[PDB]
Ligand binder design. Structure first.
Ligand SMILES: [Cl-]
Ligand SMILES: [Cl-]
Length: 184
């Protein structure tokens, strides 16, 4: 079947009916071989972010006015280089990129909390997406928990595949294989 691979992992204790609204970070972080965070520009990135938006709405979640009022946050990253991951050891290897999303982008949290295992092999031309619980306690030393992660990878590079919107099809697939991710 598909010209890509989609892996999803999630918090089995999370109650996806707890949440009503989400805020999607409105730019896709490029993980590059330099420390300064840069983002994808242009139509493609806009279409990928629109696919997250549409999918969350289909599952019952409304876009929030802002981060402070949202129940759930989503952050999306494109891996263009694995320079920072060589010799990784942490299962969440993306944390090794100096420019990676910080908890403090979202609110008063000082680190991440992963309530489930991830076993993804790093590769470029791939996406890491994390969904965070913004209702979690804030304050000094408090950690921002993730409720869902996806890894979109293994994308074919021949012209027929490039000319299909494969990233969007992979985003759609990540929701299809996450039947629990709904408040309905
Ligand atoms: Cl697990
Ligand atoms: Cl709080």
């Amino acid at each position: 079947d598909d010209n890509y691979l989609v892996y999803t992992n999630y918090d089995k204790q999370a109650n996806f009916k707890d949440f009503s609204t989400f805020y999607l970070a409105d730019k896709i972080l490029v993980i590059s071989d330099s420390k300064e965070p840069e983002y994808l520009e242009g139509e493609g990135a806009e279409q990928i972010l629109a696919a997250y938006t549409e999918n969350m709405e289909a599952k019952g979640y409304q876009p929030a006015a802002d981060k402070e009022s949202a129940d759930l946050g989503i952050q999306v990253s494109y891996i263009a280089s694995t320079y920072y991951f060589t010799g990784y050891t942490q299962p969440e290897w993306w944390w090794g990129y100096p420019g990676y999303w910080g908890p403090s982008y979202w609110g008063n949290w000082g680190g991440w909390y992963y309530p489930y295992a991830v076993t993804y092999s790093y590769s470029t031309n791939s996406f890491i997406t994390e969904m965070v619980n913004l209702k979690a306690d804030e304050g000094e030393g408090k950690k921002l928990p993730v409720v869902w992660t996806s890894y979109l990878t293994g994308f074919e590079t021949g012209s027929k595949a490039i000319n299909r919107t494969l990233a969007i099809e992979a985003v759609n697939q990540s929701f299809t294989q996450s039947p629990y991710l709904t408040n309905k």
